[model samples]
Target: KLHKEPATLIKAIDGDTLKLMYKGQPMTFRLLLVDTPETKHPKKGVEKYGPEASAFTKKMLENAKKLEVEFDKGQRTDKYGRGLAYIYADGKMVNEALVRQGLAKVAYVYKPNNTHEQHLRKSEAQAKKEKLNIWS
Candidate 1:
C-alpha cells in the first residue's frame, strides 16, 4: 500500500487532475494510470467527450467529503512539478472509478509504480465492454 495524505479539494481541473490543498498549500494532483479526454490542452483544445469527463470529475470532487492523496512508489512529482498521485474520494479510488465509468483510459504506466495497474486496466476493460462514453 502507498502512503496517503489527507487533502482538501480546491477544484478538479479535469477528469484526471485535481487542484487540492496539501501540506498547508495548494498542489496539483494527477491521477495515475488514467488519462481522461483533454478538456483544455493548449493546442489540442477540447476533444470528444472532454466536457463529460471534466464534469464527472468536477461533480465527484466537489461533492467528496473524505479526500486523500496517495503517492506512488516511484517519482513523487512530474515534469510539471504537479504531484503524481492517486485520489480517494470518500474511500473510493478515483483513478479506477474514472476508468470503470469509461471516462478515462489506462496510460502513463511506468516502472516500479504500477500497484494499481491491474485494477485500472480491468476496470477500463469493463467500461470498454459496456461502450460507455469514451468507448462509444
Candidate 2:
C-alpha cells in the first residue's frame, strides 16, 4: 500500500532536511509531517534549541544502518525542489523519532501525505506529557 525506495544519506541539513543519494543521484529531501526548530535564519541567525535539534538528527541518522525514502501520493517534490519523503532508518521513521523525542513538531500536513499523522500526534503528546527537550 506504500511505495518505498532505497537511499543513501549524504548529510543531515537539520532535523527535518537531508541530503541523500538515490539511484546514484544526489537530492535534497524535506521530511514530511515533521518540522524541527530553525538552525539558520537569514536575518535572525540561529534560533534557540536549533543546534540541539540539528545534533540530534545528525546523530540519529549517523547511527542508521539502512535508509529508505517513502513517497506520498503524487507531487513528490516541493516548490523548493526538495523531495518530500518519510525517511526510514533501520526500520524506524526518522520523522516520528524526532517528534517522539520532542525535538520536532508535527507540521505541514497535506492530505494523502499524512500516513503517520496519528502516530506523530501521539508521540508529540507523550513528549509534552513528559516535558522532554523542546516540550520542556
Candidate 3:
C-alpha cells in the first residue's frame, strides 16, 4: 500500500534534511512529518537546539547498515524538487526517532500524504509529556 525504496546516505544536510543516493542519483530529501530546528540556514543562523538535532541525525545514519525512504501516496516532492520522505535507518523510521526523542516537532503536514501522521504526532506528544529536549 506504500512505496518504500532503498537509498544510501550521501550527506546529512541538516537535522530535517538529507542528501541521498537513490535510484543511482543523488537527491535531497526533506524529511516529512517532522522538522528539526534550523542548523544550516545562512540567515536564520543556528537555533538553540539545532546542533544537537543535527548531530543526532548524522550519528544515526552515518554508518547505518541500510537506509530507505518511504513516500506518501500524495505529492512526493515539494516545489523545490526536494524529495519528501520518511527516512528509515537500519529498520526504524528516523522521523519518528527524532520526535520520540524530542529533537524535532511534528510539522509541515499536508493531507492525503499523511499515512504516518498520527504515529508521529503521538510520538511528539509522548516526548512533550516526558519533558525531553525541545520540550524541556
Candidate 4:
C-alpha cells in the first residue's frame, strides 16, 4: 500500500543519510536510487564536493523540521536492515533532488519503482555538462 507520512528530520548526515523521527521513534533513512562519494571511505577517500553535498542537503532542509515520506513496495529493511525509503519534502522527491544537483550518482536499478531513473539520468547528464564531480 502506498501511503504518505510526515516525519521530522532530526539530521542530514550527508547527501544520502538522514535521521528522521516517525511516530515517536528515531528512524534512519538512506535515500534510494543514488550513491554519492564516500565521505569517510578510507580507500576511496571523500569524493568531490563531498562536504558540499552534505552541506547542500543540510541547507535544503534548513529549519524544515518535518518532511513527507512516500513508501512503495519493498518498504521493508534492506539486507543490512536499514529502512529503504524514498523521501519527499514539500512535494519534491529528495532522491531526485540530490541527483539533479550532481551531488550523487545513480546505481542499482530497483524495479517497479525505477520511475526515478529517467530523472536521475537527466540529473547526471546536467552534472556532467556543468563539470560536476567526476565529470570535472
Candidate 5:
C-alpha cells in the first residue's frame, strides 16, 4: 500500500534534515514540529540538543531497510516542494521516536496530524521534566 519503503540513511544534516536513498530516489526529510538552531546558517548557532538530536536520528535510522512516508491532510509539499511526510520504520514512527527519546520536539507545522501528536506531547513533557536539553 506504500510506494516508498525503508532505506538506508546516507546522512543526517541536522535534527530535522536527512538525505536518504529511497527506492533509488534521493529524498530529503523536512522534520515537523521541532526546530533546532543551525550549525551552518550564519544567523543561528547550534540549539540545545541539536547535535544530539541529529545523532539520535542517525542512530535510529542506521541499518534500516526501507522508510514509510505518508502525507498529511491537504498538504503534499512545502513551498519549496519538498514532501511533508510522517516517516516510519519497523512499526515505529521515526518522528515520534525522536521526541520520545528527548531528541526532537513535537512540531505542528500547519495543522496538527493525529498520528504521533499525543505521544510527542507526552515525550516533550518528560523531556521538560528531566531537563534533558530543555532546562539547560
Candidate 6:
C-alpha cells in the first residue's frame, strides 16, 4: 500500500525534481510518472524548454498552500538516492499538472509505481492536442 507524508518545499531542483524538508530532514525527491527537460547538463548544458519547465514547477510549488509526498509500495528511492514520489499540493497532483500543461512528458513507467499512469497519459494527450509548450 502507498503511504503519504507532509513535506515542505525548499526549492525546485528542476522541472521534475525538488528539494524538500520532510520530518525536519532535508531530502531530494524526483516526481514520478513524468520527466521534464534538463535545465542543467554536465556536457550539453541547458536543453531546450528546460528553463520554462523549471520556472513553471517553481511557481506552482511556491504558490501551493500545502505539499505532500506519496511513496510507492516497493521502491522508496531511486538508484540516484532521490526519493521517488507523487507530489500533491493544495489537493492537486503536481505531476499531472506539469504533464497537462505540457511542461513534462510521461516517463519512467515502472510497474506498481505508476499509480497515476492513466491520468498522466490523458493529460499528455491533451497537451499534445493543444500543442502546448513542449508539445509544440
Model 3 has an lDDT value of 0.91
Model 6 lDDT tens row, 1-136: 6677899999889999999998899999999989899978887788888898899889889999999999866688999989999998887888999999898999968987887899899999999999999989
- Tell me the alpha-carbon RMSD of every candidate: 1.0, 1.1, 1.0, 2.2, 2.9, 1.2
User: Which stretches in model 5 have alpha-carbon errors above 4 Å?
Assistant: 1-8, 112-114
Looking at model 3, the pairs that clash are: none
Q: Where is model 4 more than 4 Å wrong at Cα? A: none
Cα lDDT tens digits for candidate 2, 99-130: 99889999969987778789899999999999
Off by more than 4 A, model 1: none
Cα RMSD, model 3: 1.0
Put down candidate 1 lDDT per residue, 82-111, tens digits, no spaces. Answer: 998889889888888889999889997896
**In lDDT terms, how accurate is model 5?**
0.65
All candidates' lDDT scores? 0.88, 0.89, 0.91, 0.75, 0.65, 0.90
* Estimated TM-score for each candidate: 0.95, 0.95, 0.96, 0.83, 0.76, 0.94
Clashing residue pairs in all predictions, respectively, total 0, 0, 0, 0, 8, 0
Which scores greater on lDDT, model 1 or model 4?
A: 1
Question: What TM-score does prediction 5 earn?
Answer: 0.76
lDDT of 3 by residue, 84-122 (tens): 889998988999999999999999779888899999999
Consecutive 10-residue window with the lowest summed lDDT within model 5? 1-10
The weakest ten consecutive residues by lDDT in model 6 span 69-78
Which residues of candidate 2, in runs, are more than 4 Å off? none
lDDT of 4 by residue, 1-136 (tens): 5677888888888878788887798887777788877677787677677887787677776655458776556544567655667787777777777777778888787776565678788988998799866567
lDDT of 6 at 2: 67
Model 1: ten consecutive residues of lowest lDDT: 108-117
**lDDT tens string, model 5, 1-136?**
3233456567777767777666677877676555544555556676656678777667766746666665555465678765566676665667776766667667654664444466678877887787766444
Best by lDDT: 3
